[model samples]
Target: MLGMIRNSLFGSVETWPWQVLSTGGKEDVSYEERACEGGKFATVEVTDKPVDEALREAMPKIMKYVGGTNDKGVGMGMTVPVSFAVFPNEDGSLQKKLKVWFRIPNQFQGSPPAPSDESVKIEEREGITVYSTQFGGYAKEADYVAHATQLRTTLEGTPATYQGDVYYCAGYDPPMKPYGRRNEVWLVKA
Candidate 1:
């Protein structure tokens, strides 16, 4: 499944951005701060307008395709704070593309750090938050909602903020490629 996603995204693994890890027979690796499980996280970038808006539009398509074809196990992902970031590229200029990278789940392996008292104020903005799960064949809206509710209950007291109704999934297409999903959960700092 990973190979399929890499192949489709790159036309061929030889040209994929995350494919570099496999150049010498090594496993693909990722160090992104949020869902980074030591595997390469997929990302796509567009520069036509506001960065967050673009992601809000593009994420659904990716999620639909990935959930239906994912080979890696997919389920109710633990709640983790995700950031929509914009910055400069390696050229030392403003980034022309938006990045959707994943970081390691902080709750896994061991606890990372609790939010410090010095954290900044919450900012409410337009975005999406998802509650996703992987099922055989296709997914239904009701199922998505159920998962989202579960997510809400799990994160009820943490710094995590619940925006409005929106959900996302992360998975790969079988017999094809793509490996991620996003259900836009708009959130603000608590």
Candidate 2:
């Protein structure tokens, strides 16, 4: 039944799902630090806009890649940390230009298809450690900001030391999914 929903979303395109070694504790497990994998990424630049609005401008540019604009002349995406990175002014004055990120699918982990959209660039990062927290429902910048704030509280008095400079808002399920839509907030921990 659910298969029909996903099929309709991506159509007949392929996707490579990530292996979750742990959620740092969502399965009744303990909340701990998350060590994220580094893979090919498509990043779109945006600034001063809220996430929903930022995504509206960004998704289409990146979408252009998967619809056969990649170097491989094929599609894109499916990895987690479909994240958004924000940096407020160097003085927290003018929110810096933001970046929205999506990872290469499992099948394309090694060699990612390059993008044709000048607005989009390929980012390859290798193993970044983070402290993360998850939430549900239709996620927006407000949701992640709250989740990130909460994670900061949890980190206090814990063994984890985090990077306050930047944090990532990652969404798992398609907005089309009605329930258990997992949205994660990740802060770098060095």
Per-candidate Cα RMSD to the true structure, in Å, reads 19.9, 10.1
Candidate 1 residues 78-142, lDDT tens each?
A: 23433343443333233344444333232221322221112111222222322222233322223
Write down the TM-score of every candidate: 0.27, 0.68
Best by lDDT: 2
> Residue by residue across 58-145, what tens digits does model 2's lDDT show?
8778777766666666545333345777653335332544588776665676687767789998877655566556454566555555
Per-residue lDDT value at 187 in model 1: 22
- CA lDDT for candidate 2: 0.64
TM-score, prediction 2: 0.68
